[PDB]
Nucleic acid binder design. Sequence first.
RNA 1: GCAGAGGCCCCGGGGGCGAAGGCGGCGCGCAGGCCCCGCCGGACCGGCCUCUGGUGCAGAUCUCGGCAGCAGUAGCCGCUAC
RNA 2: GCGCGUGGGCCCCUCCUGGUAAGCAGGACGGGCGAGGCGGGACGAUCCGGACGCCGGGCCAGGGUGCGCCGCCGGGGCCCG
RNA 3: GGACGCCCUGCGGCCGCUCAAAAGACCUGAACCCGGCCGGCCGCCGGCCCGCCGGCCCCGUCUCGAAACACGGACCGAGGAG
Lengths: 90, 127, 52, 178, 257, 148
Amino acid sequence: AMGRNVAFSNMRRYKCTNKGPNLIKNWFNQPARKIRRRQTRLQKAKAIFPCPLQKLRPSVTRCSQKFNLTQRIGRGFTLRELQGVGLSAG
Amino acid sequence: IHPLPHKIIIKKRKNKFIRFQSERFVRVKPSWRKPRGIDSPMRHQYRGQRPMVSIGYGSDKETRFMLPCGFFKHRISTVHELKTLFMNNKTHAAQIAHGVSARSRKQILEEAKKMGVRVLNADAKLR
Amino acid sequence: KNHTSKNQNRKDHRNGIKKPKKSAYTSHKGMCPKYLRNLRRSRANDPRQSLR
Amino acid sequence: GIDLKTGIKKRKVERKEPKSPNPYIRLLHNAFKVVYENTGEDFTKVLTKRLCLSKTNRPVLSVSRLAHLMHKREDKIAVVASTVTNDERLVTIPRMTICALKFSATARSRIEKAGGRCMSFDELLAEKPTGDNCVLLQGRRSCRAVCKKFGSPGRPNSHVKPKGEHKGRRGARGRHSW
Amino acid sequence: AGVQCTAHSWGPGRAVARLPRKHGGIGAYANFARGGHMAHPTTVIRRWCRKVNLNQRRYAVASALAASANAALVEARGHRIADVPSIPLVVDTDNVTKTKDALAIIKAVGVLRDVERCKDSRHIRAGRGKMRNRRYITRKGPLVIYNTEDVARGFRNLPGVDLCHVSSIRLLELAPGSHPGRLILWTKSAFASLDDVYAAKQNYTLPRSCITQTDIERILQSDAVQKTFVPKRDPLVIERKVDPFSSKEALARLDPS
Amino acid sequence: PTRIRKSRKRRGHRQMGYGRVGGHRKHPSGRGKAGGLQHKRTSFDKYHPGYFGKLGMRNYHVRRNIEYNPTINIDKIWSLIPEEQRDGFLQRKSTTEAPVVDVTRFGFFKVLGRGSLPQCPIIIKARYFSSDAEKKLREVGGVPLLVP
RNA sequence: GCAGAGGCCCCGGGGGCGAAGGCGGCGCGCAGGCCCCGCCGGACCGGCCUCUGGUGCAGAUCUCGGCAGCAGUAGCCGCUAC
RNA sequence: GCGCGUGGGCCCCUCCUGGUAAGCAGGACGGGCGAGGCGGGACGAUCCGGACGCCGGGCCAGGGUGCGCCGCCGGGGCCCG
RNA sequence: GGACGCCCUGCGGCCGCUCAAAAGACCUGAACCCGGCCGGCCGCCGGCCCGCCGGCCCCGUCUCGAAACACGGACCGAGGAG
């Protein structure tokens, strides 16, 4: 506590507290953000009713030795994968 | 209206404990505050200094909190509270709150008379 | 005052004058290595032995 | 004035009551104290103080430690004043009767499958209040990470690890590096 | 606030305190100065929210539900339940859309006195709370829990009556004032689905039941503990000191001859 | 809560627990961990061995995933086997259809031998094995196999 | 003890049959303080449990506002005068 | 285990050292004041007694007992405080 | 938002008027401070019928040590610092 056996802090000293760029984010907007993002999704869903909101994305092995076995969604299907299903990019 | 016999009530100090130097200055109120000066004659309790508050002055447990009549005090605001709080005690007496209006204090007095409960402020708001 | 030893012996004897604790007398610190190896070799046989 | 400052050495603080807000722990402590007052069985004198202990003072006891501790005495009822926990390392748990303040769900299933009975302090009070055929067992108090760092690191005979990362030569690489 | 004005200390030699002063010489920029900043200004960076583990939150709502089923806790909480025929109260109430229909159901299951305790209790509160959009205070009455029934419209304007769905049982409603013991009017559907909502917690097992004070007392009076109990040695007699030589009866106890 | 704090019990005491001879003063010993080799040298020596200096080779960029080495002791290999399967496997012993554990699928790259293994022969697959791991597994009748 | 929040105050807490505040007098408490009565006042106010804090002043050449004794005191003494 | 204050001390005894000495500057066993009320030494942070809840009765330390001022007389010796 | 009468050279006063109340340039109206009238001669603590006896240096503060010929403080109210 007061010295004695303590672990030294890795806390960086506060910057621009008195003046300058606002370096304090506040999350009072977090409950309202969920509603706003939901409203945007609901309006987009209505705009293209039969079309699903998310595009089909490929299964990708997660990168690195640590996550090698596991799979995740990636950006898009390769042209070779879309040559096997017989499709074209467009 | 008459309580249990009880014993002699000894008050260790009849007068109130007053703050040091309350007399000299109006700004210093008489409410007791503990002296905490480096050179305070009252902290040192020198000869002739005013008496200091201590637990030794505490009243006997049997006669503590007891009114001069010999009944302890219960504060009543409504007829339900008299009926519930004064549930056959011969130790405690009732005392209507300052807020209770004259109209209500007649119906609080009447129930008390039926229950034989002493009311210390019986003659209050009486006109 | 450059130096005072007054009160020092009152402070020492207030809750002090404490014994050096047991396991300090029977410590093997500073004992001859050859004796300590002999002790371990002797202990590791029959009733004293604590291995499986 | 009376000299009470000579052969008299102050007073000690021993927790005489459990600081636990839990109503259950208070209910057992008062019960075990009532038994202790009427019959001064030393098993109950310890149990009364083992219920007043802190979480740190009351360490966890696994079903692996309990198997080793009760190896020669299967019939005796283990009495633990803390949480009994499972040890996935021990493939086969022996049948044992254990009474604790809490059993982990994984531990509770294993003891019941073995055929052992997981008792509770209320059950122990009902069957054996004095503590007959019962062993008061305790976990290892100095197993906490906090206990390992207690002491002054950097003193020659301390033999304790420093609290922070430090990562420097002075004072670490032997007595000479100081 | 309090740092908008321009104030610098006059300094020594002016026979004034050293606190920062405006061009007029008016004290400024200090906690003790009128028109001055707070010594430690209130700040929005305070952590308003605290955190609870899901298990602990689930434990509290499970325990509050258990307190509702204890008749003593509900009466102690101040609900009027003498008329109510069983605790917990489960009513097969169909979709009630009219307040008058809801009042009739509540009169017939005995909850009417609680609804009237809360209707007659509406008062203007004390303090500046009035000015802060909190003018009226009423008592809390029965909590309707419902599943697959439109009972909300019927009981919403009843005074002190609060409604909740069985999927989102709220603790603040279950324990008003941190005191557990809410009179809960369950609909038949809601009570039936309570054991299904508890299954829906993916990996939660309800805390295991424990003894009560009454159970502990019964064990302390049980034959097994009484058999273990051993009688204590008789105490010592203190007897206040008297002069032995004062009377022959006093002297006799120490010296019989 | 502010109401339960000791500071609110120091009202009327003046210094507020900081001392009449030396009161609370702005940063008396300096800001932060300064004076470590000079006036606070005693504290750094008594509680911080190895704070000052450079110790070993410096890697400008550490590949965290490359240096990720998760490990499993031989004692916990059987716990990966689900309880329903575990009891049957143990009872039947069996070398024709021995249980096969791939610790890499469970997230561990190296096997170690801290405890003991049950007698049932078990095939364990890992990217590396300790010397004890191999010895204890082989003695039980299990095979230490490498995994692609 | 203070100020707010969530409850309670058995027919739903105390109030123009007089709230808070102010003033004088009791009583109770070792004391912080509380309570009652009278008088002024004129619309709000609590006890208990849980919660929260910009929560208690005799001092800081303390800030701001009033204002005393000095004190009917010092003074109302240039440029000729009515 | 965690921490706070403190790290200007001073004074009486006892042996001390330097200095012409000093209510001087430095040491030291113990105690005191600091942080110990109270009675007394006229006065006096420390000296002599005695160390403190609130009171009533009794005893009595230290210091005294013409009068201020509570409380004294007896005897022996001296006798310009 | 002040009827009427009575007065005043007039100013202004007195009666009362409106109102629930002057609440009269304004709600409550504290302390300091001051004027009338009545009572005393007086600081605090203790004892007693109550003016006598006994005791009592000015606090806060650094300080070895403050009643200090050390420093801050006329008074009172509000604000005022983990």
